[PDB]
Design an enzyme around this catalytic site. Structure first.
Site, PDB file in Angstrom:
ATOM      1  N   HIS A 163     -93.256  -9.676  17.358  1.00 52.61           N
ATOM      2  CA  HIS A 163     -93.701  -9.337  16.191  1.00 52.61           C
ATOM      3  C   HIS A 163     -92.799  -8.374  15.533  1.00 52.61           C
ATOM      4  CE1 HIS A 163     -97.629 -11.159  15.451  1.00 52.61           C
ATOM      5  NE2 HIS A 163     -97.396 -11.625  16.499  1.00 52.61           N
ATOM      6  N   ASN A 205     -93.806  -8.523  21.938  1.00 49.99           N
ATOM      7  CA  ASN A 205     -94.725  -9.877  21.668  1.00 49.99           C
ATOM      8  C   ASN A 205     -94.007 -10.636  20.590  1.00 49.99           C
ATOM      9  OD1 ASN A 205     -97.717  -7.930  21.859  1.00 49.99           O
ATOM     10  ND2 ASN A 205     -97.051  -9.116  23.487  1.00 49.99           N
ATOM     11  N   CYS A 233     -94.248  -9.400   7.749  1.00 52.73           N
ATOM     12  CA  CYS A 233     -92.942 -10.104   7.748  1.00 52.73           C
ATOM     13  C   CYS A 233     -92.889 -10.671   9.021  1.00 52.73           C
ATOM     14  CB  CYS A 233     -91.614  -8.929   7.648  1.00 52.73           C
ATOM     15  SG  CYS A 233     -90.369 -10.028   7.566  1.00 52.73           S
TER      16      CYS A 233
END
Ligand SMILES: Nc1ccc2oc(=O)ccc2c1
Ligand SMILES: Nc1ccc2oc(=O)ccc2c1
Lengths: 268, 269
Positions: free
Chosen positions: A192, A190, A227
């Site tokens: 991330h 995804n 992050c």
């Protein structure tokens, strides 16, 4: 891998690969953390939940809700060598309205001996607003039939290390590694940052002399904020002692906290 | 995994893991390159060579000699999805006094179709001085009984992409990613940067729009010098081209010393 006979836990075996081992010719803690995620994902797939790492129900999907890791705690007694077969068993158990827990037990497939244990706490969040919320009775009741009904904990002992509060490191840090940034290999499907990357970043500020003379026995990591793909992180560490350290990851510019943690190391 | 019936190649199956896939829910090229190294290591173990990625003989170990990768060339027709089983077959063949070659074929375990292929060229080096040298007849004769004796190539076609010369990118680069540095997860058991990390670093300077609209079909990477654990790298890319093609250069951030050069070919989704 497969669900166990009672259908309330999942087991999977892994053969340690050449590129998965560090300087001791044994699996790194990041390799172990990636295997814990893999067995968690296979467990969610086997019982009909999402396979994106969030293990959502259809009802959570309509509400745009996901499960996100708040804390990861891992204790390793023996790291498996290259070519060894490790068996990991995993299960979940809801924790009322607070969130849920996924636990793991790692065993040497040849001896049957427990070589490690892990526990993780998850909280529910809206994926768009990033706002946390308590778990509804409807969602908790949907997961009950996929968990053990009586308590089952990887860390049953009283006042055990996995539930301890972690303080905030004060400046100046004893050690640091600055300007860490994720590359595409650190991202998940995804886009991330993978949760295991933060374990790597925490460990970057441990001096090489400690890594060369000690073995990591325990790591506890709290996750506060992500992050992003374009962010830059500083990793800070201070000795608090076995050798024990206190850790802090923060965004390089404004100093916003993203993670805090502690590690315990045993002399070789 | 196991050696095949004739003992001249090695096969191993892998089930693609959740954390090994990218934005298409299929294995990344770095996951494929790590599996190629894993099957190469298991092949060397099965026939008695070192298992550190150098596949040395006892004679090489006495002389402090290792095999090091000079070029990696990978072509992927279909990336395997999460949960799919991929079978990889690998073998080696000496290339006279120049060096040696390790080739691989990747197949979908359910259909038996070839989904990719790869070839790598290796040169001999003294581990301490880093000086390259030609392969002696004694060393080449030691490996002959572990290789096919007639040619066996993953890339047999004439003037094929795997042997093409790669030019040096000229400044200014069209795209760049500056200040890349390895972390401990990028190191191998001997504390050297894993060869696959350099593939990741080359790809960092491809714009995200290309990655989102295209699939990587071919990558050719030359290795000139190592990035040490304390070095910092800049990744540079310039478009050279339906397909999109790029020219790549990795160099040390300070003095600009070349560490790698390469090319990539991408097809629109
Ligand atoms: N509370 C809760 C949340 C996620 C879960 O995912 C699983 O794969 C199995 C059980 C489970 C339970
Ligand atoms: N020339 C050469 C070099 C390394 C090799 O390692 C193997 O594992 C099998 C064959 C072989 C041949």
């Amino acid at each position: 891998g497969s669900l166990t006979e009672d259908g309330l836990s999942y087991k999977e075996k892994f053969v340690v690969r050449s590129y998965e081992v560090g300087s001791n010719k044994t699996a790194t803690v990041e390799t172990i953390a990636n295997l814990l995620q893999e067995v968690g994902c296979n467990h969610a797939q086997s019982v009909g939940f999402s396979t994106d790492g969030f293990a959502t129900t259809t009802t959570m999907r309509k509400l745009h809700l996901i499960w996100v890791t708040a804390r990861m705690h891992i204790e390793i007694y023996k790291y498996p060598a290259w070519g060894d077969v490790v068996e990991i068993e995993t299960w979940c158990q809801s924790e009322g309205r607070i969130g849920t827990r996924r636990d793991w037990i790692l065993k040497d497939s040849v001896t049957g001996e427990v070589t490690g244990r892990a526990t993780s706490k998850w909280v529910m969040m809206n994926q768009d607003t990033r706002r946390l919320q308590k778990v509804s009775d409807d969602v908790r009741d949907e997961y009950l039939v996929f968990c053990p009904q009586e308590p089952r904990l990887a860390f049953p002992e009283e006042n055990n290390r996995s539930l301890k509060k972690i303080p905030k490191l004060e400046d100046p840090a004893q050690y640091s590694m600055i300007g860490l940034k994720p590359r595409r290999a650190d991202l998940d499907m995804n886009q991330h940052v993978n949760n295991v990357t933060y374990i790597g970043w925490v460990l970057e500020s441990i001096p090489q002399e400690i890594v060369d003379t000690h073995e990591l026995q325990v790591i506890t990591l709290d996750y506060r904020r992500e992050c992003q793909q374009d962010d830059v992180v500083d990793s800070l560490t201070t000795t608090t002692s076995d050798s024990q350290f206190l850790h802090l990851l923060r965004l390089s510019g404004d100093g916003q906290e993203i993670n805090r943690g502690t590690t315990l190391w045993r002399k070789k």
